[PDB]
Design a protein around this ligand. Structure first.
Ligand SMILES: O=C(O)CC[C@@H]1CN(c2ncnc3[nH]c4cc(F)ccc4c23)CCO1
Length: 167
């Protein structure tokens, strides 16, 4: 038993809710919240901009030190950093950004990072400003993640479409 509430169950291990991941994180305080990161950990907009703003920019400060030490992530890769006031940990995962021409096949590699964590609160990778089809992203999630994932979908309209079209 865990504290996630109001989710629709899609499969044995994948759950979905119309929710603001920031508000969901502040209420649940999950062990892991997933950020929709880029390779530079520049949290300017989308999910990343919203999560960073909710930490009063502490996520960005920590991220800049990480990059100065380690260099950029790989597309499809991840790193674990603090969850600040939102979660114990933040798993920064880089899905491919279609608006940069990155290979959509890397979406499966991005979701594989979730399997290193038993339970996660997450957005749909490569959705939103990353330019992928959220329905494809949901399919890859279900077919790749084996650990327990709670997906927060900000837009009510997209949420309804994802549920109604789910196979
Ligand atoms: O941008 C991509 O491709 C990655 C996928 C994201 C998912 N994302 C969100 N998911 C869940 N909660 C969210 N709260 C937000 C508050 C904001 F100010 C902006 C975005 C979100 C947001 C919406 C945009 O797409």
């Amino acid at each position: 038993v865990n504290s996630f509430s109001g989710y629709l169950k899609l499969t044995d291990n994948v759950y979905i809710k119309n929710a603001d991941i920031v508000e969901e994180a502040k209420k649940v305080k999950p062990t892991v919240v997933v950020n929709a990161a880029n390779v530079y950990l520049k949290h300017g907009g989308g999910v990343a901009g919203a999560l960073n703003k909710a930490t009063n920019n502490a996520m960005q400060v920590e991220s800049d030190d990480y990059i100065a030490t380690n260099g950029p992530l790989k597309v499809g890769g991840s790193c674990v950093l603090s969850g600040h006031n939102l979660a114990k940990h933040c798993l920064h995962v880089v899905g491919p950004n279609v608006n940069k021409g990155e290979d959509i096949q890397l979406l499966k590699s991005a979701y594989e990072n979730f399997n290193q964590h038993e339970v996660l609160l997450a957005p749909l990778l490569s959705a939103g400003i990353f330019g992928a089809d959220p329905i494809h992203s949901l399919r890859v999630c279900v077919d790749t993640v084996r650990t327990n994932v709670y997906l927060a979908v900000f837009d009510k309209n997209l949420y309804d479409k994802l549920v109604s079209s789910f196979l």
